[PDB]
């Protein structure tokens, strides 16, 4: 395996990582501020995706500080990780198109 | 097997304090939630509060005068409810339940009758 | 803090008729209402989750129904071992709350 190809690989893992422990933190945060709705695991595991992918349909989101420090988090690890992907097939497609020139 | 254990009485003289045990048998998990539920003679169900064992954070009815300190012990699987400085108004059937954090109470226990008398 | 309100307190029924149970909340909740038994001197018992989905357990004659603010459970057919208290219980809002109970009475 080639770095970038790890690297990716690594991402993937540690982007399921962020978003269950990002499901988990954000309900332990949420839960004791009023009206908030992020406060269950299984649509805070939705919420999380909705989130690292910069969906963002807001159906749910944070409203306490860590809340939100947990979702800044999982954005970050998302969009980090959907462009370390780029940056590997980036990294393929030039080495292929430099054995197609001789190189 | 009962999955919730809590005794069936507390005698407290008004004033005084009275920790509520609840031990849990059956599956844990690091998810779950335990929560008490207070009810008073022919009145119905009040949400007290909540604790996640696993993690220690507990949060309580804002609504209502805070009497209430939650613990937990991880190693004997117990939940503990602290009602601190009691009057007539706190004699209550206090229940404790399991919520898979999911949000529903599937299992409860068969609560404690607490009694503010001298 | 979302109010659930159970109207009516007491439901006369004949033997063996259906009876439907109303909570309405103080605001859309989805379907995030959970519905539970108490007899005399007994702990709750769920019935029904997420409004409509069965317990197993539960007797098939127990259903429920709605979404948003309008939810409804009901028994087709009655029977004594029915007579109880029910309660709504939403989980949509922090914190959880409870209707003020509606009993069955044969």
């Known amino acids: 395996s080639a770095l970038h190809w790890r690297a990716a690989g690594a991402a993937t893992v540690l982007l399921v990582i962020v978003l269950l422990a990002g499901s988990y933190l954000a309900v332990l945060a949420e839960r004791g501020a009023p009206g908030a709705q992020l406060i269950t695991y299984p649509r805070a595991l939705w919420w999380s995706v909705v989130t690292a992918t910069t969906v963002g349909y807001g159906d749910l989101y944070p409203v306490t500080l860590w809340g939100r420090c947990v979702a800044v988090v999982v954005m970050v690890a998302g969009i980090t990780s959907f462009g370390l992907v780029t940056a590997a097939l980036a990294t393929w497609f030039v080495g292929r198109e430099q054995e197609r020139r001789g190189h | 097997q009962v999955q919730l254990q809590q005794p069936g009485a507390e005698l407290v003289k008004p004033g005084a304090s009275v920790k509520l045990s609840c031990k849990a048998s059956?599956?844990?998990?690091?998810?779950?939630?335990i929560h008490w539920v207070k009810q008073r003679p022919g009145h119905g169900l009040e949400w007290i509060g909540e604790?996640?064992?696993?993690?220690?954070?507990?949060n309580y009815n804002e609504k209502i005068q805070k009497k209430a300190t939650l613990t937990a012990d991880k190693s004997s699987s117990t939940a503990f409810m602290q009602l601190s400085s009691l009057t007539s108004e706190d004699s209550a059937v206090y229940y404790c339940?399991?919520?898979?954090?999911?949000?529903?109470?599937?299992?409860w226990g068969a609560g404690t009758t607490v009694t503010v008398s001298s | 803090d979302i109010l659930l309100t159970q109207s009516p307190a007491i439901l006369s029924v004949s033997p063996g008729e259906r009876v439907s149970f109303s909570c309405r909340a103080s605001?859309?909740?989805?379907?995030?209402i959970h519905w539970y038994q108490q007899r005399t001197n007994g702990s709750p018992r769920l019935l029904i989750k997420?409004?409509?989905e069965s317990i197993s357990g539960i007797p098939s004659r127990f259903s429920g129904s709605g979404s948003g603010t309008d939810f409804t459970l009901s028994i087709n057919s009655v029977e004594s071992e029915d007579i109880a208290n029910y309660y709504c219980?939403?989980?949509?809002?922090?914190?959880?709350?409870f209707g003020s109970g509606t009993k069955l009475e044969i």
């Open positions: 339940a399991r919520e898979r954090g999911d949000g529903y109470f599937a299992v």
């Open positions: 059956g599956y844990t998990f690091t998810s779950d939630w």
């Open positions: 604790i996640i064992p696993s993690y220690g954070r507990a």
């Open positions: 605001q859309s909740i989805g379907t995030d």
């Open positions: 997420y409004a409509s």
């Open positions: 219980q939403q989980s949509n809002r922090w914190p959880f709350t």
